[PDB]
Design a protein around this ligand. Structure first.
Ligand SMILES: CNc1cc(N2CCCCC2)nc(N)n1
Length: 154
């Protein structure tokens, strides 16, 4: 059994929008916008909701670019994260109680202050290539195992 999550990356030709997580799961790291998919909504609806609630932004089209499964040692449910990117956004991003957004040049992504798995799969995102990944975590900082491949259907 897995639980569904979303991750939205606003990736423009020279910059990517990241948010500093202010509370909750993953606080203190930069990440895309997302969270749990709820009952009653599709995965992409959950992604648009979490984007609007964490950044104020709405989007015209969301594209599937990745899926990553996470196992945490001792936790029964795997996290099944559906990763989406978009180029065009509607509005300018604003802080929420959850996320502090900020633009980053593609040359200057703060991997040291992101989730560790990001160092592995973010490059395939910046290459506009579709990927499936799996990462096994012990705690929040230590990757024990991982697999990562490119796919044609995400
Ligand atoms: C565990 N490693 C993770 C987790 C994660 N989120 C995405 C939003 C919803 C929670 C999970 N994002 C990234 N980049 N790495």
């Amino acid at each position: 059994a897995s639980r569904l999550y979303t991750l939205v990356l606003v990736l423009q030709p020279q910059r990517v929008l990241l948010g500093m997580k202010k509370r909750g799961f993953g606080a203190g790291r930069w990440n895309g916008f997302g969270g749990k998919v709820q009952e009653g909504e599709t995965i992409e609806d959950g992604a648009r909701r979490e984007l609007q609630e964490e950044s104020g932004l709405t989007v015209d089209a969301l594209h599937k670019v990745g899926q990553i499964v996470f196992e945490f040692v001792g936790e029964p449910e795997l996290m099944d994260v559906h990763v989406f990117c978009t180029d065009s956004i509607q509005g300018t991003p604003v802080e929420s109680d959850e996320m502090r957004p900020c633009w980053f040049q593609l040359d200057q992504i703060p991997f040291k202050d992101m989730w560790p798995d990001d160092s592995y799969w973010f490059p395939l995102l910046l290459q506009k290539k579709k990927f499936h990944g799996y990462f096994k975590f012990q705690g929040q900082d230590t990757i024990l195992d991982y697999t990562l491949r490119e796919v044609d259907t995400v």
